Curated annotation (Swiss-Prot):
Changing residue 56 to E: Does not affect ability to influence alternative splice site selection. Tyrosine phosphorylated. Changing residue 34 to A: Abolishes binding to N6-methyladenosine (m6A)-containing RNAs. Abolishes binding to m6A-containing mRNAs. This is YTH domain-containing protein 1. It comes from Homo sapiens (Human). The YTH domain mediates RNA-binding. The modification Phosphoserine is found at residues 81, 89. Residues 12-146 form the YTH domain. Transmembrane segments: none annotated. It is found in: Nucleus; Nucleus speckle. Changing residue 68 to I: Abolishes RNA-binding and ability to influence alternative splice site selection. Changing residue 129 to D: Does not affect ability to influence alternative splice site selection. The gene is YTHDC1. Interacts with SRSF1. Interacts with SRSF2. Interacts with SRSF3. Interacts with SRSF7. Interacts with SRSF10. Interacts with CPSF6. Interacts with KHDRBS1/SAM68. Interacts with TRA2B. Interacts with KHDRBS3. Interacts with EMD. Interacts with RBMX. Interacts with ZCCHC8.
Length: 161
């Protein structure tokens, strides 16, 4: 079903995350963590305190697809277990966010061609720099396009809200 998913997405904020390689998204899916440059770290920390759910929607550059989406469970923090990201300097990155995956399945851009993002000049939602915010209605419909991930139980997610 999709009802618990819709509950998690109610009044959420959504951000497009662009990774330059699959290895970083795989690390994020295995460890439940993400890290971004300071300019985006500041925006995500502001958003985390402002909204019931902040959703990161991931796309590997040149993959033609999204690779899933996750909900922030923390603000960024330093001093944790060092993550071996593939950098295309490690000191340039900000803190580490903890995330709970909502969907680990892929969605091809061809399936989202009808969704435009008002916060990026109404360009197709696939288009956007790393960190681009996706307006509520677009973001909700984008997440609902993904194939359901029957491996995930949103009961745990709902209780952190």
């Amino acid at each position: 079903g999709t009802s618990k998913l819709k509950y998690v997405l109610q009044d959420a904020r959504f951000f497009l995350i662009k990774s330059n390689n699959h290895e970083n998204v795989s690390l994020a899916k295995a460890k439940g963590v993400w890290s971004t440059l300071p300019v985006n770290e500041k925006k995500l920390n502001l958003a985390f305190r402002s909204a019931r759910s902040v959703i990161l929607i991931f796309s590997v550059r040149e993959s033609g697809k999204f690779q899933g989406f996750a909900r922030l469970s923390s603000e960024s923090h330093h001093g944790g277990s060092p993550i071996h990201w593939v950098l295309p300097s490690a000191k340039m990155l900000g803190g580490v966010f903890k995330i709970d995956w909502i969907c680990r399945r892929e969605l091809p851009f061809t399936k989202s061609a009808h969704l435009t993002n008002p916060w990026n000049e109404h360009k197709p939602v696939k288009i956007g720099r790393d960190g681009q915010e996706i307006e509520l209605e677009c973001g909700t419909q984008l997440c609902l396009l993904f194939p359901p991930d029957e491996s995930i139980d949103l009961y745990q997610v709902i209780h952190k809200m």
